[PDB]
Amino acid sequence: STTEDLAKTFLEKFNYEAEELSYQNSLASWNYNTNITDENIQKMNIAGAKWSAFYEEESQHAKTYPLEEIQDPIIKRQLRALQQSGSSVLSADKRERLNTILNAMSTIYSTGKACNPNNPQECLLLEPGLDDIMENSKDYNERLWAWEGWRSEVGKQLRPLYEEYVALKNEMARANNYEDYGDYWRGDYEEEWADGYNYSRNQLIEDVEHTFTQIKPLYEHLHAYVRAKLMDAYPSRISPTGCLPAHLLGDMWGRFWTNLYPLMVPFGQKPNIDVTDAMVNQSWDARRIFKEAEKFFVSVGLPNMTEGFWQNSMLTEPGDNRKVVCHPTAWDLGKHDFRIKMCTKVTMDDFLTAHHEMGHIQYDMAYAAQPFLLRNGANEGFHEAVGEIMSLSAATPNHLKNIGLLPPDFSEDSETDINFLLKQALTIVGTLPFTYMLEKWRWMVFKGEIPKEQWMQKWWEMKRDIVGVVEPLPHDETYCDPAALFHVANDYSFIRYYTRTIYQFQFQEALCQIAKHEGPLYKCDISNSREAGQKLHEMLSLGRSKPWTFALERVVGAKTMDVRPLLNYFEPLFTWLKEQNRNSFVGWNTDWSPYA
Amino acid sequence: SKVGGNYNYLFRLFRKSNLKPFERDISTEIYQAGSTPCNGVEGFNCYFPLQSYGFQPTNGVGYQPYRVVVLSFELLHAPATVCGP
Structure with missing residues (x-):
């Protein structure tokens, strides 16, 4: 047998x-x-x-099989999925340093x-007091105590090994067998390939x-709203055009x-549609809510839950004596037993985001016939993008x-709807910037281009x-502004959020362009319309028979971003913005040295 | 579908040619396909021909077991064995 053929036998078993x-x-x-x-x-x-x-x-086995006399594309795809391997040789010293x-x-x-620095009696962990403040409290010494105590208490226990780990970051991001670890945080998307679809960083x-x-x-206006609610809660500190002093961060x-929502009111009558008491009063029943999930996919043809689904699929938190985290994690047990692990109660989360969970189930069945290497969502970015779609469309x-x-x-009431558009825009465009800054630094230090001296001057002169x-106290060169976060220690690459954001952004362009909107991207609805039902649901459900680029293009169009529907948001929100709070403006900052 | 699960169903993996209807092969020698003969060393394209099923109580709709029964007939001038009311 050829190497391909013996590895194919070993494939048939593994x-x-x-x-x-x-x-x-x-x-x-x-x-x-x-x-x-x-x-x-x-x-x-x-x-x-x-x-x-x-x-x-299996990895050690995969290292043994060669690849040079192999001439099969899809078989080679499965073979590479098999042959991914490595990391069993590092010495005690260096392995100790890194890991x-x-x-x-x-x-x-x-x-x-x-x-606490001033009243160390009422001193508490990371969760209760600090998150209590950012969710409910509006006291200046409270917030200031939060920030200063956390900094001067946690940096002191993290910093020295982490400066030696500035050096260690340099060395291991250069050495760890790949191009660089900035592009390995971008590495599940890192590309050195071919076949026609070269779009990249x-x-x-x-x-x-x-x-x-x-x-x-x-x-801009969203920042105005959040930071202004805070600045009103603590009035009379700042000039308008420039940036803000930061002993009042908020997180x-x-x-x-999102941490800074309520009070400021240029968008200011009543808040977005909230249906706690509405469900209390009229109670559109949730069973019929899942039935309209069924119906608005039975105009496209989709089934319901089972008794086994009721038994297994757990959507809330256990809430009992069990010590578990309420972090919602999309799940599947395999073997067609698609179950879920969220923290989901009967709310807008239930209705819309559980259309999206029951769609986890339906989507799993949509790719239930895939081979071994493809039993997963075509993209986790699809999940979030279409979850936003489902929320804003079925709400x-x-x-x-x-x-x-x-x-x-x-x-509807203008100012209230206007608040809702406020918050939606906040999330959608407020994703990227600070993480962009740290990712620029991380890219070129993990490639080794920053020398060991210009870090902090660069940070300030990339802070106003x-x-x-914005950041108040001076993080001098000894401290590790390059990395001081548990999630960086936890390899949760944020910027993939923005990558799928632009992807899905122009994907929405192409998709609701086929759907033929009059103007903007919302109201791209499906209910009780058979023709639109096929033309978007058979549209969204294709599969994974071809490479990722071919799949995404054929499915959902072009490889760019929107302006047309966001522009048809802008100009109408420009006119409305006029008629209530006509005094919008411009600015984004990064070149500072504030407190010094 | 028992709570622990059932791992007691198994099929063939390797062969050289195709079979004929109503035919059976029972050889269970170490399968070798390398030019270097396989003295009986596990690995290097020499494995165990059977492969189990691994069933569980909570399998999916598509994977839940079904009991297949075939009532085949032979249609010739042979003596008949079918009756009715």
Whole structure:
């Protein structure tokens, strides 16, 4: 037999072995988050170690099989999926440096807590007091205590090994067998390939610039709203045109801008549609809500849940004595037993995001016939993008009246709807910038281009006038602004958010262009319309028979970003914005030295 | 579908030629296809011909087992064995 043929025999066996042990680890995770005891923890650890050992001996096998006399494309795809291998040779010293440093910060982050500089009596962990403040409290000494205490308490326990780890970051991001670890944080998307569809980080960064130049102003006004509610809650500090002093940040590092929502009112009558008391009063029944999920996909042909689905699929938190995290994690147990692990209650999350969960199930069945290497979502970016679509489309009185529960002459209140558009724009465009800054630095240090001296001067002179950051106390060169985050220690690459954002952004262009909107991207609805039903649902459901580029293009159009529907948001929100709060403006910052 | 699961169904993996209807082969020698003869060393294209099923109680709609029964007939001038009311 050829190398291809012997490896194909070994393939015919390890497919079955992999499905079996993957399902076993799937029930292992099921018992992980359905009940928690020490024996359970040890059991999940041993099962994971066992399957990892199987994968590692498979890896050593894969190193043996050559590839040069192989001439089969799809068979070669499966062969490469088989032949991914490595990392069983590092010496004690260097392996200790890298992995021990990472795991050490992981463990201290898990097992750390803080206290107060001025009144150390009311001192508490990371979760209760600090998140209590950012969710409910509006006191200046409270927020200031939060930030200063956390900094002067956690940096002191993280910094020295992390400066030696500035050096270690340099060395291991250069050495770890690949091009660089900036592009390995971009590495599941890292490309050195062929076959016609070369789009990459060059176009990525260039459309970053062009995205600013076209659709930045709504993010401008959104920043105005959040930062202004804070500045009103603590009035009389700042000049308008420039940036803000930061002893009033509002969160830890600025992951989201969602942390700063309510009070400011240039968008200011009543808040977005909230239906707690509406569900209390009229109670459009949730069983019929899942029935309209069924119906609005039975105009396209999709089934419901089963008794086994009721038994297994768990959507909320356990809420009992069980010590589990309420982090919602999209799940599937395999073997067509698509179940879920969220923290989902009867809310807008239920209706829309559970259209999206039941669509996890339906989508799994949509790719249930895939071969071994393709049983997963075509993209996790699809999940979030179409979840936004589903929320903003099925959260609709027109759907609710098409099922016949609301009248069709609804009038709305301008300022309130305007708040809702505020928040939506906030998320959509406020994703990128600070993470862009740190990713520029990380790219070229993980490639080794920053010398060991210009870090912090670069940070400030990229903190007031180029594109926008803010941070109060001076993080001098000893501290590691390059990396000080548990999620960086946890390899959760954020910027993939923005990558799928632009992808899905022009994907929405092409898709609802085929759907033929009159203007913007919302109201791209489906309910009780058979022709639109096929023309978007058979549209969205294709499969994975070809490479990723071919799949995404054939499915959903072009490889760029929107301006037409965001522009048909802008100009109408420009006119409305006029008629209430006509005094919008421009600016983004990054070139500072504020407190010094 | 028992709670622990059932791992007691198995099929063939390797062969040289195609069979004929109503035919059966039972050889279970170490399968070799390398020019270097396989003395009986596991690995290097020498494996165990059978492969189990691995069934479980909570399998999916497409994977839940079904009991197949075939009632075949032979249609010739042979003596008949069919009756009715």
